Symmetry: C2
Subunit: 129 residues, 2 copies
């Protein structure tokens, strides 16, 4: 009777779909992942809502991603929330220049109505490799 | 029959007791607030466990706090967790010099066995006032 937790699997699926959507600049699909009170804090401490996050990080006329390498990750699932810690190396173009930056990031996902959404994200800058 | 939620009140009490313990350098009382897998990420991305967090931030032979001003805060309580966002201005002495620094911080608290514990914290540096 013992089977993989559908709750834990659906989180791994969202973390994949989100990455695909970021690489690809898929604004419609990325919005669908975001909780209605979503917020994102970048490594300078600037706060984005759903709409402005999407404008800056997920619109292929401004930003073109080549990679986000996940060096490291810890996932903890609670009852209604999950907390993810990650060290990422981001690679993207912005205005025909190309940028690299590493971060220690934390996110929270919210499990409601049998589905997960991305609710909060925050970046803390790390030194380059 | 309608009464203040004991769950939401006990979180406000922990956020107070923690502050008192930080100002005062109360290592025994601060340890009691920490979850058993506690971690703390500072604004450079360095990771502390319970023991090393306490050594660096809560031992009055190394650090002497004069203040942590909470400029701003959002609390969201879920079923088993709470997520707190805060802008803090920290003021402390370390080796007879005196330091100021502002941060955008996020924390997670874990509600188990009818009690809250501080489970995760992360800092992202902000510019001075």
């Amino acid at each position: 009777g013992m089977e993989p937790s559908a709750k834990h699997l659906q989180l791994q699926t969202l973390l994949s779909e989100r990455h695909a959507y970021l690489m690809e600049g898929n604004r419609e699909a990325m919005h669908q992942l975001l909780s209605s009170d979503f917020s994102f804090i970048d490594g300078q401490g600037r706060q984005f809502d759903a709409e402005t996050y999407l404008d800056h990080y997920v619109d292929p006329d401004q930003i073109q991603w080549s990679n986000q390498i996940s060096e490291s990750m810890v996932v903890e699932v609670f009852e209604t929330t999950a907390l993810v810690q990650e060290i990422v190396e981001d690679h993207f173009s912005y205005g025909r220049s190309m940028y690299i930056g590493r971060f220690r990031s934390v996110s929270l996902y919210h499990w409601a109505n049998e589905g997960w959404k991305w609710h909060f994200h925050q970046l803390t800058p790390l030194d380059p490799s």
